[PDB]
Design a binder for this molecule. Structure first.
Ligand code: VN3
Ligand code: VN3
Lengths: 209, 201
């Protein structure tokens, strides 16, 4: 079995202000940096095989602390970026609700709906799922005989993680909103048991702190 | 929206020996009581509204440590019992696999399959889900972030959670087994449930 760990970036100042980011490249807050230190310790002990991060700095900075704790290089991939949120980037929840009452809630319940200029959950899965497939192909050590519990660690964002997870689990799109919201520096683990499609993923942990 | 928290029982002696329990009333082990304390600590802080426990002692006792921690009567409902596992109750993994090779694994992948004499995951969801809807009706208070806590079992939690999420039966095996004294949180916003936490320790 292949263990896949997915870590949401630590707290940013925008998170503190309930302000939407998307692919705006915001900074970790001080608290966010200490969160990343704490998470690296926990995940470091699990002895990751590999670290792949979103190139957005809030994720990348989170990933670098795990790299320091484990002596692994941090690989970077734009396909792990958070959902592009188009017109909503830079606005707060309150601001969005004032303009479009009910649009946020509606967005949340429809995995095919994108904000104007942005991405849907389905779009994000379409870019991120093949990356997991590439790592299955490129990392023979993963779930291999020697050390089969050593996880691949993807460091990213909450939207990306829900989308990628639902897609790996092969939930129908209509059910993707069943997956909730990750905490800052919280993680999710899937296991892939066994062609890439033949892999059967299950959810071991959603949103551990 | 309403928070629903579901806690699996602490470790039993049967768990250490990979021995199936079902609705056999087995006991918490030493380590299991310890686990139940620690979990009581964490979950007490979220200021639970109310507690329902399976009447099985491994679950009931687990619930008690939280009840003590926060001062509420641990309500009991037999509808929170673990999957009845028929012929498998009392048998070990090694034992089941020797008699019916591949049945145990295949069972995990089919929410509709029951051990002979026992219940399927679909059966378990149908009997336990009415308890949640009853608590929706009979409990006005739903401070709306205070959680309702169900203390129960790994099978029951997976099945009930999948049913609340309205996952298709075919996808119910997407949910992996809960750790001992680990918990899950659903949020209900008919109501649409989402998964906030699966198998936190
Ligand atoms: O705040 V995020 O990009 O998960
Ligand atoms: O082994 V338990 O009844 O979840």
């Amino acid at each position: 079995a292949r263990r896949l760990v997915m870590l949401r970036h630590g707290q940013t100042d925008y998170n503190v202000g309930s302000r939407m980011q998307g692919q705006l490249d915001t900074e970790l807050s001080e608290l966010g940096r200490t969160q990343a230190v704490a998470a690296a310790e926990v995940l470091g002990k699990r002895q990751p095989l590999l670290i792949v991060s979103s190139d957005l700095r809030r994720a990348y900075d989170t990933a670098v602390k795990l790299g320091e704790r484990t002596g692994l290089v941090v690989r970077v991939d734009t396909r792990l970026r958070e959902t592009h949120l188009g017109d909503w980037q830079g606005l707060t929840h309150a601001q969005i609700d004032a303009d479009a009452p009910g649009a946020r809630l509606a967005w949340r319940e429809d995995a095919t709906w994108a904000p104007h200029g942005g991405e849907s959950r389905v779009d994000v899965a379409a870019r991120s799922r093949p990356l997991v497939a590439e790592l299955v192909a490129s990392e023979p050590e993963w779930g291999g005989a020697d050390e089969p519990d050593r996880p691949v660690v993807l460091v990213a964002h909450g939207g990306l993680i829900a989308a990628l997870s639902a897609a790996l689990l092969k939930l129908p799109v209509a059910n993707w909103p069943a997956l909730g919201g990750m905490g800052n520096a919280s993680w999710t683990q899937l296991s892939g048991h066994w062609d890439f499609e033949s892999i059967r993923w299950r959810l071991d942990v959603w949103n551990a702190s």
